[PDB]
Paper text:
TRPV2 is a member of the TRPV subfamily and shares ∼50% sequence identity with TRPV1. While heterologously expressed and endogenous TRPV1 localizes to the plasma membrane and is activated by noxious heat and endogenous and exogenous vanilloids, heterologously expressed TRPV2 predominantly localizes to intracellular membranes. In addition, TRPV2 does not respond to heat or vanilloids in vivo812. In heterologous expression systems, TRPV2 activity was shown to be increased by exogenous small molecules such as 2-aminoethoxydiphenyl borate (2-APB) and probenecid, and blocked by ruthenium red and Gd3715.
Here we report the structure of full-length rat TRPV2 at ∼5 Å resolution determined by cryo-EM single particle reconstruction. Based on the cryo-EM map, we are able to build models for all transmembrane (TM) helices (S1–S6), the pore helix, the selectivity filter, the N-terminal linker and a portion of the C terminus of the channel using the previously published TRPV1 atomic models as homology models. All six N-terminal ankyrin repeats of the ankyrin repeat domain (ARD) are clearly resolved, suggesting that the ARD is a rigid, stable domain in full-length TRPV2. Despite the expression of full-length TRPV2, density accounting for the first 73 residues of the N terminus (Met 1–Asp 73), the S1–S2 linker (Ile 422–Gly 430), the pore turret (Glu 561–Leu 594) and the last 46 residues of the C terminus (Glu 716–Pro 761) are not apparent in the cryo-EM map (grey), suggesting that these regions are flexible or disordered. Like TRPV1 and TRPA1, the pore of apo-TRPV2 consists of two constrictions or gates: an upper gate resides at the selectivity filter in the outer pore region of the channel and a lower gate is comprised of the distal end of S6. A more detailed structural analysis of the apo-TRPV2 pore domain unexpectedly revealed that the upper and lower constrictions are wider than the homologous sites of TRPV1 (Gly 643 and Ile 679) in the absence of ligand (apo-TRPV1) with distances of 12.4 Å and 16.1 Å when measured Cα–Cα at the upper and lower constrictions, respectively. The upper gate of apo-TRPV2 is wider than the closed upper gate of TRPV1 (apo- and capsaicin–TRPV1), as well as the open upper gate of TRPV1 (RTX/DkTx–TRPV1). In addition, the lower gate of apo-TRPV2 has a larger Cα–Cα distance compared with TRPV1 in all states, including the open lower gate in RTX/DkTx–TRPV1 (14.4 Å). These results suggest that the TRPV2 channel can accommodate partially hydrated Ca2+, Na+ and K+ ions, as well as large organic cations in the apo state. Our analysis reveals that in the absence of ligand, full-length rat TRPV2 contains wider upper and lower gates compared with the ‘minimal' rat TRPV1 and truncated rabbit TRPV2.
Residue numbers in the entry:
A (entry chain D): 194 to 418, 430 to 561, 591 to 715
B (entry chain A): 483 to 561, 591 to 674
C (entry chain A): 194 to 289
Write the structure that this text describes.
């Protein structure tokens, strides 16, 4: 039953699943949902596909939202559909069916940032005793205080399309971090980051340590001509760009050159492209004759040294601060420069026009004396209307402080609007986002790739006949009655 | 303090140069006892302790930026003593950036459009620390360091009875 | 009863006191804690030392934490161990 209102188009709609059982989930009744399967004349099925090749369970998550009362009733229906499902179709695994794009519902629950089922969906208490074949996503053995255990459906990085495949790259994120702060995905941060943070430091070394000695060329550089060490520099200046060119290019080969939707913090990823791209300007002048090489390779060295700020990351906490401010002030920096710099055009014209009694861009430095500010203020009376330019410049002492103030207080508003543990968790997102490249290896060509031997403990504890899973053991301390 | 003493008769010579720091840090460390004659100290060690972590994080970020730009200054201005030429960049640290534009370098716009990049990020480099501090006070402390005043006193009681 | 899990090493543990009465504090029951002293065949004792030479009361504080509900029940056991203790061993000072 598909149409205008039943299509997922923006506004005047809701994509409930375009068939009788699909809206029966949205009806929050749980009485006809049983009967429309139990009906002996023509029984329905969760197997019923739609315009995007979905069972009802994909529509449950799309119809689910940030309304606790709705998610609570949605959860209650959702859990019992597996009890009615697995009973009537035990041969069919229910939460592994893919849409038309090739995406499972538990994975697709991460795609739209569903809040309040999604935490529930991972953390489920109903297999033992009444569906022992369903497997919880939870288990426990040996507790005085509980030694817990969580399973792995698709959420571990390497399994070909996890949530780590989309929450890192294809995240349509109203805000992510919380979805990640839940215990099985949250704890997973450190289980491999122990093994990866040393290799991150080992690769971070290789990012920054060669950028250090990349500078000493310019220290020893002559303008016009064991001294082979100076000439040797050129061979590492080749590698300065060419290493970080290919490396950041084949990232887009696996990111397929994905569209600007990931503008959020992938500008940091393309800040490496700036150094990579801009290093070549000198190389292919430099033997030939062309001449603009020393003038513009300045910026190649500049932005490279600038972009070493990026890794203010995980050796200490502070970064919880770093990207919180650095991200939000990139919006402030845009709003700052758009307001300020455009004021002083007509006043540099007013300065040169009143001081009459293409090189005015250099005469605008007279006004840029007061930007720091170190306003000259030097009053003379050769202009013959002395009070014009003198009573002009006193107008800017107040508004220049205001132009700092309003941004100082637009910032106050950003911190007055409290963030409890939002960007504190984005520290772990920035780390877990940086985990994307760790398991894959290096088409940089140290070793052309790296394999996968980073999977978690074999469950081998389920109900007959399929007894097998992949799982992980977690520790807890609880103080209830027992 | 001893560095001067056991040069000073003998002949060795580096005594007046390095006893400066003995006098300096001694006068500096008289800040320590901003303690109990008035309350204020409830403020003193609250900030002084937490900003010692901020001071470490501040210097690690800032000072290392201006190495390659002092090289960029001397390299573009061609047309071991560069540590003294780095004072040209440390003019803008306070800041009292010279800004003096000349055209003998023959690519005038390189070093001129370079230096304008640092007016924004130097304010940002203050800002992010100003607001990393805001975050430390946004994360409210009710009577925590107000009581650490009494800890600092009761910690200083350790030596009083012993003699 | 000492081992890997019963040792105080970081993670995969809790140092409860490595003997029957020591975990009987952690069980939050206060019914067997009396009987394992009142038992006429072989009575236990708070005098029972462990790998760090402790009574049960040193383990109570190590097992105690920043959980109000746990400290509340821990306090209730802790106070009554002195009432059962001082009654049955009045000669011995217990918290020294």
């Amino acid at each position: 039953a598909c149409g205008r209102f039943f299509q997922k188009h923006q506004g005047t709609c809701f994509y409930f699943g375009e068939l009788p059982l699909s809206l029966a989930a949205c009806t929050k009744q749980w009485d006809v949902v049983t009967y429309l399967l139990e009906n002996p004349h023509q029984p329905a099925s969760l197997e019923a596909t739609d315009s995007l090749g979905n069972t009802v369970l994909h529509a449950l998550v799309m119809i689910a939202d940030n309304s606790p009362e709705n998610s609570a009733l949605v959860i209650h229906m959702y859990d019992g559909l597996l009890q009615m499902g697995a009973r009537l179709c035990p041969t069919v695994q229910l939460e592994e069916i893919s849409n038309h794009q090739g995406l499972t519902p538990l994975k697709l629950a991460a795609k739209e940032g569903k809040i309040e089922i999604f935490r529930h969906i991972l953390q489920r208490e109903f297999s033992g005793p009444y569906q022992p074949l369903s497997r919880k996503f939870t288990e426990w053995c040996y507790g005085p205080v509980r030694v817990s255990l969580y399973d792995l459906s698709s959420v571990d990085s390497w399994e070909k399309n996890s949530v780590l495949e989309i929450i890192a790259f294809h995240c349509k994120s109203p805000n992510r971090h919380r979805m990640v702060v839940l215990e099985p995905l949250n704890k997973l941060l450190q289980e491999k980051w122990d093994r990866l943070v040393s290799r991150f430091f080992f690769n971070f070394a290789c990012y920054l340590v060669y950028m250090f000695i990349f500078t000493v060329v310019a220290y020893h550089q002559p303008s016009l001509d064991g001294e082979s060490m100076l000439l040797l520099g050129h061979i590492l200046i080749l590698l300065g760009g060419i290493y970080l060119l290919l490396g950041q290019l084949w990232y887009f080969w696996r990111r397929r050159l994905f569209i600007w939707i990931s503008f959020m913090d992938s500008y940091f990823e393309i800040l490496f492209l700036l150094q990579a791209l801009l290093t070549v300007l000198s190389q292919v002048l430099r033997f030939m004759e062309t001449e603009w090489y020393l003038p513009l390779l300045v910026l190649s060295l500049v932005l490279g040294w600038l972009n070493l700020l990026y890794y203010t990351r995980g050796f200490q906490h502070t970064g919880i601060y770093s990207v919180m401010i650095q991200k939000v002030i990139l919006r402030d920096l845009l709003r700052f420069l758009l307001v300020y710099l455009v004021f002083l055009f007509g006043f540099a014209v007013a300065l040169v026009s009143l001081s009459r009694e293409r090189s005015i861009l250099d005469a605008s430095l007279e006004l840029f004396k007061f930007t720091i500010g170190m306003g000259e203020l030097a009053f003379q009376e050769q202009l013959r209307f002395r009070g014009v330019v003198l009573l002009l410049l006193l107008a800017y002492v107040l508004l220049t402080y205001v132009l700092l103030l309003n941004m100082l207080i637009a910032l106050m508003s950003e911190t007055v609007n409290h963030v409890a543990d939002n960007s504190w968790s984005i520290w772990k997102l920035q780390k877990a986002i940086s985990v994307l490249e760790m398991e894959n290896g290096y088409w940089w060509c140290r070793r052309k790739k790296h394999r996968e031997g980073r999977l978690l403990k074999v469950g081998t504890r389920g109900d007959g006949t399929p007894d097998e899973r992949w799982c992980f053991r977690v520790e807890e301390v609880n103080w209830a009655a027992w």
